[PDB]
Amino acid sequence: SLGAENSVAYSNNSIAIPTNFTISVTTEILPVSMTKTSVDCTMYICGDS
Amino acid sequence: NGLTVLPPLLTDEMIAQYTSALLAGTITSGWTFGAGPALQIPFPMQMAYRFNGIGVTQNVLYENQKLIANQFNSAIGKIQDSLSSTPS
Amino acid sequence: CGKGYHLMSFPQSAPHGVVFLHVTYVPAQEKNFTTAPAICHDGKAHFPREGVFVSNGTHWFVTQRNFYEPQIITTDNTFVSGNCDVVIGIVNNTVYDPLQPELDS
């Protein structure tokens, strides 16, 4: 179901105006950094040999 | 072979349904439906608000509404031709 | 900056990340009304300065477009431009004036 169905009561001279407000606090999460890993090529491929 | 194509989760019909929903919300309630509940408003006042947004007073619309409607309709109609006629 | 009209946001930290607390203004309790693009007083059309004309069904009021604060139409909640013929949907009502009462007192 894509969403709740709704219809707006449009007419050539009708308006809707709010009378009260709700203050909402919401959270956004955004990754900033990544694990800084370094790899030793010779020790990984060959090693001590 | 060994290959596959996977179907999109939303079909073309549901994508067009969302597009229809956004168009209806914009036409009936302007921007008010993106900040929360939709507040209906007649379209010429919505366009008058969008004229205040750019620094042109409301009267400039209400005294030219016929010209503005004709220009907007002509531009939308020409968009279809500009799209089909140009192949690239 | 969050969904709704943005008031302000507060940053927070997280492991390898950031978190934003978005404080937004969401309207509610909407009320139906009847509006006019302009209100004709004596052949001159008056348009609102920073709000929208609404009618309680008996009287006409001007209010800020985002919050219902009905106020009485005056020559300071409106401005005059053009005659009542050109505008479409114009309604007839009275425009109050502060100068004439004190001038006549």
UniProtKB/Swiss-Prot annotation, chain A:
The entry annotates sugar attachment on 12, 20
Q: Which domain of life is it from?
A: Viruses
Q: What's this chain's function?
A: Precursor of the fusion protein processed in the biosynthesis of the S protein and the formation of virus particle. Mediates fusion of the virion and cellular membranes by functioning as a class I viral fusion protein. Contains two viral fusion peptides that are unmasked after cleavage. The S2/S2' cleavage occurs during virus entry at the cell membrane by host TMPRSS2 or during endocytosis by host CSTL.
Q: What is this protein called?
A: Spike protein S2
The shown residues of the full protein are: 698 to 746 of 1273
